[PDB]
Amino acid sequence: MTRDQNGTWEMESNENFEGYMKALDIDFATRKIAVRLTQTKVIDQDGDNFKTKTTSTFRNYDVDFTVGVEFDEYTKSLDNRHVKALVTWEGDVLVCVQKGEKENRGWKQWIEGDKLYLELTCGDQVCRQVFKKKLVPR
């Protein structure tokens, strides 16, 4: 079930989100708020079609894609840049390459049991996040 990323995932850890945001040139006042925020990931996955929402108390980031289909991603509410994005499977890891102004920009997202791992990369900065599958009703 390592390819099934469906559901709601609640952030457990967030390492070096500051460096990732700084590499994206996000302004200092925004980073000061954003580094503290818990995030939630909501994934609606139907085969290779993904609809994703990353939410917080401050701002949300939405991106939808089909595995294997390059798309024009506009990173609204993050750094507000246009990139050419492609998501593919490398094994059971979902890998996105975002070609554009910033070198070495992309992300890798994968399941281990009840945990979702996400590594966000830009240039020489890597942010490593872990989310836990939302607790089901009592």
Ligand X SMILES: CCCCCCCCCCCC(=O)OC(CO)CO
Q: Which residues bind ligand X (CB under 6 A)?
A: 26, 30, 34, 39, 41, 52, 54, 56, 58-59, 61, 63, 78, 107, 109, 118, 120
Of 35 and 137, the one with the shorter C-beta distance to ligand X is: 35
127: nearest Cα among 34, 21, 39, 46: 21
Binding residues: 41, 109
- Nearest residue (CB) to ligand X, 122 versus 137: 122
Smaller CB distance to ligand X: residue 86 or 120?
120
Question: What is the number of helices (H) and of strands (E) in the chain?
Answer: 2, 10
Taking the complex as a whole, the smallest distance from the CB of residue 35 to ligand X amounts, in Å, to 9
For residue 108, give the nearest of 120, 116, 91, 123 by alpha carbon: 120
| Known binding-site residue numbers for all-trans-retinol | 41, 109
- Least separation in angstroms between residue 138's CB and ligand X is 28
Query: Cα-flanking dihedrals φ and ψ of residue 18, to 5°?
Result: -55, -50
Q: Which two tokens stand for residue 82?
A: 């246009």
Closest by Cα among 4, 5, 41, 36 to 18: 36
